[PDB]
Amino acid sequence: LNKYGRPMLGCTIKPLSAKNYGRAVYECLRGGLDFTKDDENINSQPFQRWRDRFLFVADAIHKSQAETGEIKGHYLNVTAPTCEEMMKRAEFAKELGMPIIMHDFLTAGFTANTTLAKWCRDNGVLLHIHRAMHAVIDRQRNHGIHFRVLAKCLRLSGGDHLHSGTVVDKASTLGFVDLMREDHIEADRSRGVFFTQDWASMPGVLPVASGGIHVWHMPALVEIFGDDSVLQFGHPWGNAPGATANRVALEACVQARNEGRDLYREGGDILREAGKWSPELAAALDL
Amino acid sequence: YYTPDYTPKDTDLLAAFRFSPQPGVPADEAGAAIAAESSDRYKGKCYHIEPVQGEENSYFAFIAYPLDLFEEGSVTNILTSIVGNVFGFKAIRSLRLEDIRFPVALVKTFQGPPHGIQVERDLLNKYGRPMLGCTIKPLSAKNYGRAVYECLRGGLDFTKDDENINSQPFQRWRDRFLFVADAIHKSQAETGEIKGHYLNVTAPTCEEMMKRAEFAKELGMPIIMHDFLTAGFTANTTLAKWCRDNGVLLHIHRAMHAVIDRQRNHGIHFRVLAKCLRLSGGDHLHSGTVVDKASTLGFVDLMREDHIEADRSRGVFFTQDWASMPGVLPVASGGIHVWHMPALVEIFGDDSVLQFHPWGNAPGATANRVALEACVQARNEGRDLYREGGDILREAGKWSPELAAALDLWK
Amino acid sequence: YYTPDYTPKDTDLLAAFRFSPQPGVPADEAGAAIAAESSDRYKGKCYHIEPVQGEENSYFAFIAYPLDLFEEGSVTNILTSIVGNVFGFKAIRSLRLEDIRFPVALVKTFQGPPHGIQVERDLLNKYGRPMLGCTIKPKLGLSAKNYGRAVYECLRGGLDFTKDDENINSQPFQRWRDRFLFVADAIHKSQAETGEIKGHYLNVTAPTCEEMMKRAEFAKELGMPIIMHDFLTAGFTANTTLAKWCRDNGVLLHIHRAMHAVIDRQRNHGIHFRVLAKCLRLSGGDHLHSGTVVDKASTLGFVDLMREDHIEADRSRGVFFTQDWASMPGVLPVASGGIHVWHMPALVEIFGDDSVLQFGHPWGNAPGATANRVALEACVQARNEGRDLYREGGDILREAGKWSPELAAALDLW
Amino acid sequence: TYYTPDYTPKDTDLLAAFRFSPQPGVPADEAGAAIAAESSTMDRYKGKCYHIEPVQGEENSYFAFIAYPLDLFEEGSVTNILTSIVGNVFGFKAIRSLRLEDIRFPVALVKTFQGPPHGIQVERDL
Amino acid sequence: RIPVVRLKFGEVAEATSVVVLPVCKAEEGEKKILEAPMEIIAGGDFKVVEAEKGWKRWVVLPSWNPVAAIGKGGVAVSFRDDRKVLPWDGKEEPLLVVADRVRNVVEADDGYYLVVAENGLKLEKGSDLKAREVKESLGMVVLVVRPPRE
Amino acid sequence: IPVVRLKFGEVAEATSVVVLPVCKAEEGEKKILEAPMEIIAGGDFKVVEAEKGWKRWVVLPSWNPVAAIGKGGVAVSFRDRKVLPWDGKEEPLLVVADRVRNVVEADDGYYLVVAENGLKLEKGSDLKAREVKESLGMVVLVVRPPRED
Amino acid sequence: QQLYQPFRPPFRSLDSAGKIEILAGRMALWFEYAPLISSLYTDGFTPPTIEELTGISSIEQNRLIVGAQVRDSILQSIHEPELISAFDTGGAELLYEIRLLSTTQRVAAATFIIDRNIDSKGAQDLARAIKDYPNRRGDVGWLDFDYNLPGDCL
């Protein structure tokens, strides 16, 4: 996807007919974002059957990538009732040429998920997982499966992304972030890794932050998740202006980190606020 | 066995062995047993024996075979039947298969080389000169791809992939193929002459090999690499059939020949491997370098021309016909400098794939290429390259300071 | 290179070369040259060098390669990466690879033998004794009817396998489908009229992989328990493909060298056979020819490597690295070549109870057969009763038997 | 080019024996070379009227023994063979009457062919 | 230690360059080595040579680079058995030792120098000679030649 | 009959013992008729053994003609013959001759005979024209001094 | 087409078009002309447009940008220009991926990796420890450790 140094940036859609869907996602893309995300439960309900939505989102991605030069994408969803129909939708997503695809590993089972990952390997499309059930089996402290085991096994089966979630315990989250993206981790009770889990040169998986955040918390995230990450998230001007605002804000934060401006200390002031299209940023930032 | 009075029926199969007996077994019995170990009329008749020229306790044996006894159109069956376990004969010090004569009738049965010299040469429009190529010396996809772009746009015709680099945890064949297809498309668009990169299609299975070949087609690659000896002749012949079916140039790589033929007391001299390979299938073929150069030039002329006369001196034994089955292209297996460029052209004719620096990659590329030109050109005008080599490269003659910048590097 | 003050990580690959350099070459330089020209942190390491025991100019070199240089489960890749070109060297007078130390990793990735010893030993309802198999001496010129006749004869005598010959795979005097159909009718008629599960090896060393699959498909449909394939002559690629297929469908898989003598014939070059044996236990196979015994040390060595699940180094017999196998099943060895019955006590001791015997005929085929099918009980019965064999074998074999079974006269021949 | 009564054919050549009669007013070698070269079209790829013989019979009847280079014919067909041999040579007008008598296939062009499916012996056994 | 290049069978096929050295033997002793002609005058065309002194025994050696480098002061010493002369292991074969009397002074600690031993003639490490304060030697061993075998 | 510079390692195919007894041209046929024919490298020491002792010993690197000779090997110094001293003198010479091939059979092949003073090399055809079917030695190679430039 | 509506910034006396001429032959010091490319796409260019014209993969472009950034942050911080010179002689792996927030951490890691000369992931090798301060919010063992020298803080 020809994107280096900086993290990748993800838009969500507030809600629709399929024409509305295409115009809206084309706006929130051309504004200068990397990825867009379908909602958590939009696969085949009788508004947007897969074929019409897929076609239109693909056309929008084409138009936007063309008229902006850079490369972009949408997390198309394929969580399907049966398996062979999941494969139908995957094939169709490939025909148009979209490079990324969603899934819901728990609610669709590790079996079909592994099949999808293996199929991806052959068809070269970046698979992007999405928890969508985790909270049923982790949140209770004294019972269930701690999420880091799910993360480990998921990187063991398939997935080029993972909705780790927001950060503002955080020690455990940062720990298992290191547990999935690296390739050798020393045991550390404090960080929450118990065993020196080796990884034998198996590739990593970008952790993804999602929900409950906004541009005002931009620095900390860039500070916490480093560079290799997928940061993701109405605006008082519309979708495109707020989109470009997010882009330029993240860009300024990267510039400042490289410049060695202490983000955690200066996070409230590093903002552009003048110059680099702060008009498009609007410095809206009302509390 | 051992009837040393026999005229080989011109449609029989012939074999020329070189062996050394044990202290007490006569040479004639040795040849008899050798021919017999192939098996009525279905017995190899040891039609001739003689001693070698000068050495002690080592003799040439000349065996005949009925052609029908062999498979209608295989190489692996030929090898199984001809060299199955004769070597395991416990009553022989050592031996080494030195050549095989295939009758014209047996040659007809194979597909042969997929495309061949003239068909290939036409597909690339590269006439009246050898075809140059370097091996991209290393990394992940993007670096490799832009590197191919650099070292290819610089006028090189072919770029080679390293032999041990086929698929790995840190290098997935899908990615190599995608990026190199991109780079080749861009470079061929910019320059115009059809450019080419080898692509190592070597697979743990056969279905995997076919899948990779299918992908390498879909991208639009013209040429693909494939080891033969380690990957065995069966897979190789199948790949050859598929190449003819899909119009792709197939490029071979010895990659284990040095375990068989390095020494001259066991193994099979590379002549028989070359003949067998031409039979099964393959366009290009690694054939070492030249700095015994007579033997190398010999079997090069063998695997290329369509009618080779016997010459013990050059290193051939039987007048081997071809029935206009096409030829293959030998390859100068690296280990050379621009300084050795002219002498190569002197011997490897116009039809040869030559292979191979500061100031970055692409300047080295164009330097090598312009070195190739004005040498083939000079010989076209009429010189003795062996005597004028340093002068044909007197300087960057009518050229920018890059090939000159690499000439003085000869120290 | 050449950092001998070092140890290999327990999931690296190791190789044991035995070499001899040119005049005026220091051993360490040569070893480091091997390690280098055989392959940042991806370089090989010539982590050990020593000279041979007793003999002149010839050193063992232990070189440790990093795991990440290897395709996940590809014998052919392993080979073409290790022994690709290192033999094509100038300073090295001679070079011979004699062992490989496949680690735990990259072993759990191979398909392995398609059935292993235990499973097939269950399939073919035979136990205790080693399997018995004779070949078909009337190699060539044989008619189709004659082939079916002869094989039914050689089976009903009480044989377990009728090894089809090697050079015969398809000819203008014999066509695969024809011989397949006929030997199949024969084995059916035999099995039905003797009360045992018997099988006949069939050659599918086809020219092109497609025909190999086609003939294997037929060999299955007709109903067959085993087929034969020759790896070195058809290359590890085709072999692994056939092994995968044989794991798909319920068929055994018998291998047979038919080339090895070109690679291992002398004690200074080529690849010693135990490396091929290891690689072949990885790729695919159940039965594998392993010469004879009338040097036994190396033979027992590369037998154990093909039949067991844990071995220690034991430089004596000819192994150089303790090689684990992670319960990957072991393959069955085949003692084949120039074998009169006079050896029954020897083999049944050397190759243990668990192997297979091949036999390359007083007054026919059924008589010689049933004769041969003695001391596979009688001598085995003696052993399980407690009897010197390697130095008392002649006593039991019809000198303590004296049995009207035709093996009496057959034995009196020699 | 024309009737070449010394081209004793190499083994690998293919051979054809025609039986014909010429239009009035044309000598032998003319008609023979016409027959040969007609089925043709370097001159390496032309037939040669390597033999002409008057039928030792009634009258105006001649055997023409012609060679053919192997390269002209396909690797596995009899259709290309028939098209090459009897393609349009009968359509010629300088021949009062022509009849293709016999063909000889060199073993080189027979090894590749798939022959009968089972032949005599295998079929009797079945 | 000592550079050892072994002469091999079949090496007679095509030597492009070859050099000549006088021959002295263990039995002949140190006196013979002093007696041997040091300067071999090269008036050679493809090799023509004359010696300052007449010498009965001559060995023809290939132009291996260490042997070629010596030029004047080059001698070959024949030893019946390798083990006695070699500080290290031997295979019980005749030994040919090439020595340069020009560098006889012991300056190379690792260099091997031919010296007169009580038993006969021996090759000694320079450091060892320095420990005994032996400033000079018969010749400095340049190469050890081993016989062709099967 | 090649003319070769004494040059090191031009062809890389091997390195071993060969020897020829040397004669001067001024000496004449008598020296050639007396030089030792059989020079046998052996034992393991490889010190060469001659059936008889010879004063001057030169070796000719084992190029193919030299290796071919075997018995009858001889080397002949030849010295020039300048009209003008300032004009550069021709180099000293040496002739590798096979005395075993004394008989004159090849017209192209040069053969060693005797000049009025010293020895001479004459074409086989010329010798046959002069009716001499015999010569001392057959020349198998020509000389040229080690040139580093 | 040719929008680049996202972020756009709004040798000091060069032209506009032929700026890339300073980059085909790279006649300047390695890590000073990266802000030149910064100002080049300040007018609204993108590395995808610069690859096929200059011959610098986007990875190398960002490498040069951050390397110029580090050389600038260290030029205004410490004496011994050899450190900066230790960068001008190539070898930018020692400086990449500045996670160390402030400048004191920057100079500390810089001089330490110059002292020990560990390229090939050595930068992150030290960073993963230096940013892991020896207090970790009041752990056990902050009383006998340094915090500014990586040798005593690793």
Swiss-Prot record, chain A:
Cofactor: Mg(2+)
Primary site of residence: other
Keyword Isomerase assigned: no
Keyword Metal-binding: yes
Annotated positions of the N6-carboxylysine modification: K37
UniProt GO cellular component terms: carboxysome
Location within or outside the cell: Carboxysome
Enzyme Commission number(s): 4.1.1.39
Entry keyword set: Bacterial microcompartment, Calvin cycle, Carbon dioxide fixation, Carboxysome, Disulfide bond, Lyase, Magnesium, Metal-binding, Monooxygenase, Oxidoreductase, Photorespiration, Photosynthesis
GO molecular function terms attached to this record: magnesium ion binding; monooxygenase activity; ribulose-bisphosphate carboxylase activity
Biological process, per Gene Ontology: photorespiration; reductive pentose-phosphate cycle
Positions of the catalytic residues: K14, H130
Binding site for substrate: T12, R131, H163, S210
Mutation effect (R51S): Forms stable homodimer in presence of RbcX2 but does not form RbcL8 form
UniProt modification remark: The disulfide bond which can form in the large chain dimeric partners within the hexadecamer appears to be associated with oxidative stress and protein turnover.
Reaction(s) this enzyme catalyzes, per UniProt: 2 (2R)-3-phosphoglycerate + 2 H(+) = D-ribulose 1,5-bisphosphate + CO2 + H2O; D-ribulose 1,5-bisphosphate + O2 = 2-phosphoglycolate + (2R)-3-phosphoglycerate + 2 H(+)
Secretion signal, residue range per the UniProt entry: none
Other facts noted in the record for this chain: RuBisCO folding and assembly commences when the nascent large subunit folds with the help of the chaperonin GroEL-GroES. Monomers require chaperone RbcX2 to assemble into RbcL8 octamers yielding RbcL8-(RbcX2)8. RbcX2 is displaced by RbcS; as RbcX2 is removed RbcS mediates the ordering of an internal RbcL loop (Thr-64-Leu-70) in a catalytically active conformation.
Function of the protein: RuBisCO catalyzes two reactions: the carboxylation of D-ribulose 1,5-bisphosphate, the primary event in carbon dioxide fixation, as well as the oxidative fragmentation of the pentose substrate in the photorespiration process. Both reactions occur simultaneously and in competition at the same active site.
Sequence similarity: Belongs to the RuBisCO large chain family. Type I subfamily.
UniProt note: domains: Binding of RbcS probably induces a conformation change that displaces RbcX2 and triggers the final mature conformation.
Swiss-Prot record, chain E:
Stretches the record annotates as C-terminal beta sheet: 2-148
Subcellular location: Plastid, Chloroplast
Top-level lineage group: Eukaryota
UniProt free text on domains: Has 3 domains, the N-terminal alpha-helical domain, an extended flexible linker and the C-terminal beta-sheet domain. The N-terminal alpha-helical domain stabilizes RbcL dimers and RbcL dimer-dimer interactions, facilitating RbcL(8) formation. The C-terminal beta-sheet domain probably dimerizes Raf1. The 2 C-terminal beta-sheet domains are swapped and pack against each other to form the dimer interface.
Protein task: Required for assembly or stability of RuBisCO. Acts at a postchaperonin step to fold and/or assemble the large subunit (rbcL) into RuBisCO. RAF1 brackets an rbcL dimer (rbcL(2)), leading to rbcL(8)-RAF1(4) complex formation. In the next step, RBCS displaces RAF1, thus resulting in holoenzyme formation.
Subunit structure: Homodimer.
Family label: Belongs to the RAF family.
Protein name per the record: Rubisco accumulation factor 1.2, chloroplastic
Gene: RAF1.2
Full protein: residues contained: 287 to 436 of 449
From Swiss-Prot, chain G:
Free-text function comment from the UniProt entry: Required for assembly or stability of RuBisCO. Acts at a postchaperonin step to fold and/or assemble the large subunit (rbcL) into RuBisCO. RAF1 brackets an rbcL dimer (rbcL(2)), leading to rbcL(8)-RAF1(4) complex formation. In the next step, RBCS displaces RAF1, thus resulting in holoenzyme formation.
A GO CC term attached to the entry: chloroplast stroma
Region spans: N-terminal alpha-helix: 11-154
Domain notes: Has 3 domains, the N-terminal alpha-helical domain, an extended flexible linker and the C-terminal beta-sheet domain. The N-terminal alpha-helical domain stabilizes RbcL dimers and RbcL dimer-dimer interactions, facilitating RbcL(8) formation. The C-terminal beta-sheet domain probably dimerizes Raf1. The 2 C-terminal beta-sheet domains are swapped and pack against each other to form the dimer interface.
GO biological process: ribulose bisphosphate carboxylase complex assembly
Encoding gene per record: RAF1.2
Protein name, UniProt field: Rubisco accumulation factor 1.2, chloroplastic
Organism of provenance: Arabidopsis thaliana (Mouse-ear cress)
Subunit structure: Homodimer.
Region of the whole protein represented: 62 to 222 of 449
Tagged with keyword rRNA-binding: no
Main location: plastid
Keywords: Chaperone, Chloroplast, Coiled coil, Plastid, Transit peptide
Family in the record: Belongs to the RAF family.
